[PDB]
Design an enzyme around this catalytic site. Structure first.
Site, PDB file in Angstrom:
ATOM      1  N   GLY A  28       2.282  51.771 -59.782  1.00  0.00           N
ATOM      2  CA  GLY A  28       2.527  51.977 -58.636  1.00  0.00           C
ATOM      3  C   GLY A  28       0.949  51.821 -57.817  1.00  0.00           C
ATOM      4  O   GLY A  28       1.026  51.419 -56.595  1.00  0.00           O
ATOM      5  N   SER A  29       0.091  51.884 -58.635  1.00  0.00           N
ATOM      6  CA  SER A  29      -1.400  51.931 -58.098  1.00  0.00           C
ATOM      7  C   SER A  29      -1.624  52.940 -57.145  1.00  0.00           C
ATOM      8  O   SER A  29      -2.217  52.810 -55.810  1.00  0.00           O
ATOM      9  CB  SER A  29      -2.005  50.404 -57.857  1.00  0.00           C
ATOM     10  N   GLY A  30      -1.049  54.137 -57.424  1.00  0.00           N
ATOM     11  CA  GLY A  30      -1.094  55.210 -56.260  1.00  0.00           C
ATOM     12  C   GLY A  30      -0.109  55.346 -55.379  1.00  0.00           C
ATOM     13  O   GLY A  30       0.417  56.603 -55.001  1.00  0.00           O
ATOM     14  N   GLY A  33       3.103  57.667 -55.103  1.00  0.00           N
ATOM     15  CA  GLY A  33       2.487  59.102 -55.607  1.00  0.00           C
ATOM     16  C   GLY A  33       2.165  59.034 -56.872  1.00  0.00           C
ATOM     17  O   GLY A  33       1.574  58.079 -57.548  1.00  0.00           O
ATOM     18  N   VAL A  35       3.330  58.326 -60.199  1.00  0.00           N
ATOM     19  CA  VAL A  35       4.427  57.958 -60.806  1.00  0.00           C
ATOM     20  C   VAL A  35       4.171  57.086 -62.056  1.00  0.00           C
ATOM     21  O   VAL A  35       3.124  56.528 -62.155  1.00  0.00           O
ATOM     22  CB  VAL A  35       5.479  56.927 -60.106  1.00  0.00           C
ATOM     23  N   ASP A 165      12.366  56.024 -51.046  1.00  0.00           N
ATOM     24  CA  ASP A 165      11.502  56.744 -49.904  1.00  0.00           C
ATOM     25  C   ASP A 165      12.132  57.107 -48.658  1.00  0.00           C
ATOM     26  O   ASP A 165      11.481  57.330 -47.799  1.00  0.00           O
ATOM     27  CB  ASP A 165      10.165  55.865 -49.643  1.00  0.00           C
TER      28      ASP A 165
HETATM   29  C1  GK5 Z   1      10.240  58.315 -59.490  1.00  0.00           C
HETATM   30  C2  GK5 Z   1      10.646  58.270 -58.032  1.00  0.00           C
HETATM   31  C3  GK5 Z   1      11.111  59.675 -57.457  1.00  0.00           C
HETATM   32  C4  GK5 Z   1      11.485  59.782 -55.953  1.00  0.00           C
HETATM   33  C5  GK5 Z   1      11.563  58.476 -55.153  1.00  0.00           C
HETATM   34  C6  GK5 Z   1      11.904  58.612 -53.976  1.00  0.00           C
HETATM   35  O1  GK5 Z   1      12.123  57.266 -53.221  1.00  0.00           O
HETATM   36  N1  GK5 Z   1      11.843  59.791 -53.163  1.00  0.00           N
HETATM   37  C7  GK5 Z   1      12.395  59.797 -51.757  1.00  0.00           C
HETATM   38  C8  GK5 Z   1      13.472  60.813 -51.726  1.00  0.00           C
HETATM   39  C9  GK5 Z   1      14.089  59.549 -51.263  1.00  0.00           C
HETATM   40  C10 GK5 Z   1      11.216  57.347 -56.034  1.00  0.00           C
HETATM   41  C11 GK5 Z   1      10.924  57.235 -57.306  1.00  0.00           C
HETATM   42  C12 GK5 Z   1      10.676  55.782 -57.567  1.00  0.00           C
HETATM   43  C13 GK5 Z   1      11.516  54.936 -58.062  1.00  0.00           C
HETATM   44  C14 GK5 Z   1      11.300  53.741 -58.400  1.00  0.00           C
HETATM   45  C15 GK5 Z   1      10.224  53.102 -58.283  1.00  0.00           C
HETATM   46  C16 GK5 Z   1      10.010  51.527 -58.607  1.00  0.00           C
HETATM   47  O2  GK5 Z   1      10.585  51.051 -59.311  1.00  0.00           O
HETATM   48  N2  GK5 Z   1       9.110  51.013 -58.112  1.00  0.00           N
HETATM   49  C17 GK5 Z   1       8.740  49.550 -57.861  1.00  0.00           C
HETATM   50  C18 GK5 Z   1       8.377  48.745 -58.809  1.00  0.00           C
HETATM   51  C19 GK5 Z   1       6.855  49.390 -59.373  1.00  0.00           C
HETATM   52  C20 GK5 Z   1       7.156  47.627 -58.907  1.00  0.00           C
HETATM   53  C21 GK5 Z   1       8.903  53.754 -57.910  1.00  0.00           C
HETATM   54  C22 GK5 Z   1       9.367  55.162 -57.572  1.00  0.00           C
END
Ligand code: GK5
Length: 349
Positions: A28-30, A33, A35, A165
């Site tokens: 994610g490059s930050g 959060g 991750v 999100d």
């Molecule tokens: C792990 C995680 C935990 C929570 C949430 C969230 O949306 N919470 C809010 C409550 C809804 C999201 C994640 C998450 C899921 C998928 C990716 C992902 O595939 N990113 C895009 C690719 C990188 C290019 C990144 C973070």
């Protein structure tokens, strides 16, 4: 039955995770959060693991931790990110202090797709269809995304899409300042705090995203809030009397009334070469008065999605009890509620 956990340093903290999760790698490059991508050896899935940063340091943090966990536990829809796992190395409430959330990992976000690929009209249909199908589900649980943008649409190699999100709102003034994508997809009523807003803010964002998939260009790339409002009003016209009355911010009402009245532009001339059905749907999404925008459920039935639309396969959500949102609790009470939710988690089939 408690998994065995192992420790490593990642993102300048100690990650302690069950053995089933292997090859953790920051992503994610930050942005999303803290991750990491991981391989879930138990399911054979590529997963994203989010370690909550300092989840119980304030009432605000504790409540938002509970909020995020509640939201993820509820969402069970193909086009909406959901919870694969949630864990803590803690063996009791006393020692409980870190929360890790596990979801599907998609290969990319839409920001990288529209930047690096040519989207055909068919790609636009399928992608927007999936966003609206997921939003119908989210809206049906009375959750508002509020911050829908290309970077929170996660997409696999088959252009299958999940919404990330939602319902967490967030954002500092500095983050919303200037020539920034953080603000370009925001409905003007929320950008300028015209009134108490609702789920209809999300349809504006979809309109901005769809236009951008069609043209390859940001629809309203404002350099600041005011420049953005002017870009918006040039396209959709200045407000009429009826909308003006609904702007309960007297201050905001007074400013917007200072502007030279402008008519709505011709969308067929703005979106040259676009599918007339795409143009029509854009017109129904990009309405200044939020009361009059097309809803997600209505949009799914629009002729632009004739090839994807299936009314028996556009599910709604089970009731989501968000009465906690009205509730003032102490840190240790938010922390206890979060722990109950961790302990009671049952994984998907
Ligand atoms: C792990 C995680 C935990 C929570 C949430 C969230 O949306 N919470 C809010 C409550 C809804 C999201 C994640 C998450 C899921 C998928 C990716 C992902 O595939 N990113 C895009 C690719 C990188 C290019 C990144 C973070």
């Amino acid at each position: 039955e408690r998994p065995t956990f192992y420790r490593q340093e990642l993102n300048k903290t100690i990650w302690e995770v069950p053995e089933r999760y292997q090859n953790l790698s920051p992503v994610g490059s930050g942005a999303y959060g803290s991750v990491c991508a991981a391989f879930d050896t138990k399911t054979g899935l590529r997963v994203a693991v989010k370690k909550l940063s300092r989840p119980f340091q304030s009432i605000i943090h504790a409540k938002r931790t509970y909020r995020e966990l509640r939201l993820l536990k509820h969402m069970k829809h193909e086009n909406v990110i959901g919870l694969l796992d949630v864990f803590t190395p803690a063996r009791s409430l006393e020692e409980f202090n870190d929360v890790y959330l596990v979801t599907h990992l998609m290969g990319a976000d839409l920001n990288n797709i529209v930047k690096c690929q040519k989207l055909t009209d068919d790609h636009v249909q399928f992608l927007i269809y999936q966003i609206l199908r997921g939003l119908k589900y989210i809206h049906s649980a009375d959750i508002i995304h509020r911050d829908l943008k290309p970077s929170n649409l996660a997409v696999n190699e088959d252009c299958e899409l999940k919404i990330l999100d939602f319902g967490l709102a967030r954002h500092t003034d500095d983050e919303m300042t200037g020539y920034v994508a953080t603000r370009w997809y925001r409905a003007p009523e929320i950008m300028l705090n015209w009134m108490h807003y609702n789920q209809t803010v999300d349809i504006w964002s979809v309109g901005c995203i769809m236009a951008e998939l069609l043209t390859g260009r940001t629809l309203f790339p404002g350099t600041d809030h005011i420049d953005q409002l002017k870009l918006i009003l040039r396209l959709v016209g200045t407000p009429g009397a009826e909308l003006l009355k609904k702007i309960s911010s007297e201050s905001a009402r007074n400013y917007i009334q200072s502007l030279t009245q402008m008519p709505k532009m011709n969308f067929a001339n703005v979106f040259i070469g676009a599918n007339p059905l795409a143009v029509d749907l854009l017109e129904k999404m990009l309405v200044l008065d939020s009361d009059k925008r097309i809803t997600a459920a209505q949009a799914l039935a629009h002729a632009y999605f004739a090839q994807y639309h299936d009314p028996d396969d556009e599910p709604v959500a089970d009731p989501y009890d968000q009465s906690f949102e009205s509730r003032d609790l102490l840190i240790d009470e938010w922390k206890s509620l979060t722990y109950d939710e961790v302990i009671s988690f049952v994984p998907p089939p």
